[PDB]
């Protein structure tokens, strides 16, 4: 509940730094090299400040970005896991699994 509260008050810039922290330094360096200085300043600041965020909050952030990349076609694989996340949000864990079993077949 506290995690949830903390997750819904993250700015989009905080969510992006949390995403970057989880993808690691090499991939983060690749994004930062294409940003402007003011963007790099803000994101770098949150990486340093959000280092060590709860992994469950990070996972919720990744799921949020997973849905963004699915709906905008940056990611065109892993539809099963996307369905699993969607059905769990809309139906709850236990009815989603019965859909998921029928969905895999």
């Amino acid at each position: 509940p506290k995690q949830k509260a903390q997750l819904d008050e993250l700015s989009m810039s905080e969510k992006i730094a949390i995403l970057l922290i989880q993808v690691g330094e090499d991939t983060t360096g690749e994004i930062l090299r294409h940003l402007d200085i003011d963007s790099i300043t803000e994101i770098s600041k949150q990486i340093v400040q959000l280092n060590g965020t709860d992994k469950q909050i990070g996972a919720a952030v990744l799921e949020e970005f997973f849905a963004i990349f699915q709906s905008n076609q940056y990611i065109n694989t892993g539809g099963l896991e996307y369905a699993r996340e969607l059905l769990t949000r809309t139906l709850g864990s236990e009815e989603a699994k019965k859909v998921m079993d029928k969905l895999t077949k």
Binding site: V23, I31, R33, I75, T77, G78, E81
Partner: protein
């Protein structure tokens, strides 16, 4: 390797792959997402 840990690794690997694939586009996506809010 719980189901949760494995599912986490599924989306992380695909998100990492997308960032590596087109870093300039994701960088601008991030700028646009920030400016949106």
């Amino acid at each position: 390797f719980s189901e949760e840990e494995v599912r986490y690794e599924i989306i992380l690997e695909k998100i990492r792959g997308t960032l590596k694939e087109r870093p300039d586009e994701i960088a601008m996506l991030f700028k646009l997402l920030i400016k949106d809010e």
